[PDB]
């Protein structure tokens, strides 16, 4: 259950990351256009049967069940894996943009104060 | 048949363990990065708002 | 400690000074036409006083100051800052008195949706629904708010979030003894999530719920229902839910309440049951 | 160990929501400023 | 190498230039101070970089600027972190004051967490760490960030049980466990917290622990099926007979099945010592 | 292929017309048109010529009044030369790193340091040189409090030093990183592994002190006892006390049956066992 909940939450986080990346791209485009305009303004068993007996059955059965579940987990794990990797790259890619944007505004404001006098 | 099944189970367990190693480390790094970017964007928005407010007040003073 | 009395006294003095400033603002405007500098400064005092009251653990005073600032700045034709201050007041109200927060958030939602900002309106609607759920048991208003938020999210093409709202709506509707909507929502969500890579593993669960919600109507339409799922999603047969359903059906077909109860006990012992599932199983057992 | 992973994932998610909210505010204000600048330039010119 | 002497000489030259510029009487002076401090940091001269940073922060604050002033104050504080722990606390307190005044309570909570961490790791003090953690938890709870508040409260309760009266530990553990019981994802861990609380009741008297465990079993049925409940019942039964042998046998068996945190070890040792 | 010839012709034409335009205020237009020509050359996939033109445009931008654009163009030129003469790319990336450090952005400087170390280690055989850049990047990251990156760089340099037969640096770094990981509430499960590695390195000095080292690790970290690495190490040391080749071979085979051993572990194991 914890595995499944983690998977779904990761999916939601990825969608949110894509949304914020789109927002950042829009911010950059709009700000650049605005600045330019303003400038233009100017398996058989698991235990030995030492004594047979009912106790030896369920134990074996239990082990068998365990094996099954573990198999599933493997796939789950690996699947979930891919997700985070992509996210990593995506996150980094926004930062640069934002940073660049920030820098621009500062210089823009500086210019807006240097042309006046 | 014993050795095959038991070693197979152990191998599966080890595979899961190693995957979780790598990706717990990855998620920790990602958390640090997100921590940085949040403050970055907050400062950016605050500064742009402040500068544009200066622009409004100056232009209205001149006109 | 000293914090309580000191913060209360200083905040009261600052608020009284702000009151005097706003009282003198009208005279200043009449005599000289100073503009809005006095009003903006008074709004700054009000915001600072609200924040100080918030640090002083006096939620009501912070909410009142936020409301005063929001009203004054709305009088200044600035709807955005008014909406922001009203959101802060609503949180303080949800943190002081919730009834006031309801109308504050409604006003903020109206202001935001006037400009077409649907995402913020949906988030505020979700917050209002949560407020209703936590204290009161007035389910109907929560369902209405959740439906509105889900409609907005679907209209914004933001999938995987409207799904959760619809799941909440269906789960709450199934409580009121109205099963058709729950069945429809559960089957739709399950078939939608079947094809997703990550969500696929969860899909099975949804089906089970529908089956339980389909069992109350009549047993005959439950059996058939299971078939319809198994042919579409063969892997469903592997999950424990199918075996549990088949055993419960076999036990009920002959009025064998004891076998049904024993199977339920065993399944609960292996994994603890949820209150929703416990209640629904009890309801089914009544027959 | 799975139980350990869960909380980290949750915290990262909530932080993502907060940053998203901030981005929406920033873009809205930028668009409004663009509109105001357009008005000023077109009418003054 | 050339780095040490060259960067030190250039930093001194830039400091002298900024001093002369202010002597003429201004933003250029602040920029020169910032560049000199950056080069000092690059030179590994950790000390005296925070001094230049604080000078720049004061000069910038002189002209009503507050954001960059707070950022540079935090920069100086973290720079002094390793060279001089004491001054970092004061710089971070100043930054916290400014940020809380302006209302960015999340930043104040983060700085409080950092202050508590530095206090507990390098210097030796528990009361100040407890106070800072409680303040940060209060801020986060006011900001409805439940997970961080839970973490801070858990740490505070752990330290209070380590030294302070166990009442605080009982309260915090009970509240956290009750809150976590209803949560879907977190319910599975709830048992743990409850167990801890019960142990803290043992340190006072056996009857209080018995009543508390009965109440917890009534509240949380699954606690009855937990191995912790069986271990507690067995330990209390052994203690009621003043038989250290059964106590030791049960403790050793439970340790054999699962390793100990070294917290439970301390509580068990304390309880065993007082068996008499 | 038609595409390569067509794109090469288009890029050459654009660069030639850009040169003519600049030869004819003018600095900004020249820089922009040269940047466009460099982009078209990059899409033409002539890596060497495209990188040369791009670095020329970077220098021309340096002639223009701007720093951020200069650093961006320098890093792009370094990436373009990544598949060309390594020396020019290294020089350009070093200049970009110097500018970034001058701007106080130590994190990007550390990233570029790691990148240049990677290209140096993978392309050429000189390993010691990459050690300096890795250590500098680790120092920068540690100064910026990014513990994860510092740990990664320290692990890489420690492994390379262990390969270089300087066991002292490797053991120091491994012990420090392992104890730091054990202290941290997270990553604790990995700590065991580090300890094991240290033991192997310490064996290359002598065998008798290895017993003391493993006992010290045991008393410092009790859980290490239950790890199969501890059992394997103690069994190998006990077997080596008698000069029999079968025992340690059988032990390593039994361990290998579960998980395949890596190249680094295998080479050090062969080194220890053969003598």
Residue numbers in the entry:
A (entry chain I): 41 to 82, 130 to 204
B (entry chain G): 197 to 259
C (entry chain J): 0 to 286
D (entry chain H): 215 to 259
E (entry chain K): 0 to 24, 38 to 288
F (entry chain L): 0 to 23, 36 to 286
Text of the article:
The membrane-anchored SNARE (soluble N-ethylmaleimide-sensitive factor acceptor protein receptor) proteins provide the energy to drive membrane fusion in various cellular contexts, such as intracellular trafficking and exocytosis. Supercomplexes of NSF, α-SNAP, and either a syntaxin tetramer or one of two binary complexes of syntaxin—SNAP-25 reveal atomic details of SNARE processing and show how sequential ATP hydrolysis drives disassembly. NSF comprises three structured domains connected by flexible linkers—the adapter N-domain followed by the D1 and D2 AAA+ domains. Six NSF protomers come together to form the active form of the enzyme, a homo-hexamer.
To gain insight into the structural nature of binary complex formation and disassembly by NSF, we prepared a complex of NSF, ɑ-SNAP, and the binary t-SNARE complex (21bin20S) composed of full-length soluble SNAP-25 and soluble syntaxin-1a (1–267) in the absence of divalent cation (i.e., non-hydrolyzing conditions) and performed single-particle cryo-EM. First, models of the NSF D1 and D2 domains with substrate bound in the D1 pore were built into two high-resolution (2.88 Å, 2.92 Å) classes from a single dataset, differing only in the state of F protomer engagement with substrate. Next, the dataset from which they were derived was combined with two additional datasets to enable the 3D reconstruction of weakly populated states with ordered density for the ɑ-SNAP—SNARE spire. Classes with evidence of NSF D1 domains engaging ordered ɑ-SNAP—SNARE sub-complexes were carried forward; eight 21bin20S models were built into reconstructions ranging from 3.39–4.01 Å in resolution, differing mainly in the orientation of N domains and a sub-complex of three ɑ-SNAP molecules and four SNARE motifs relative to the D1 ATPase ring. All classes revealed substrate-bound NSF without Mg2+ needed for ATP hydrolysis and disassembly, and share the same overall architecture, with a spire composed of NSF N-domains and the ɑ-SNAP—SNARE subcomplex on top, the NSF D1 ring in the middle tier, and the NSF D2 ring forming the bottom tier. As such, the stoichiometry of the syntaxin—SNAP-25 complex observed is 2:1, the dominant species in solution. Three ɑ-SNAP molecules bind the 2:1 binary SNARE complex; a flexible linker between SNAP-25 SN1 and SN2 blocks access by a fourth. Of the eight 21bin20S classes with the 2:1 binary SNARE complex from the dataset collected under non-hydrolyzing conditions, six engage syntaxin and two engage SNAP-25 within the pore of the D1 ring. Docking the 2:1 binary complex structure back into the seven individual 21bin20S reconstructions reveals an apparent preference for syntaxin, with six of eight reconstructions featuring the N-terminus of syntaxin H3 bound within the pore of the D1 ring. Taken together, we observe that the NSF D1 ring can bind to at least two different SNAREs, syntaxin, and SNAP-25, in various configurations.
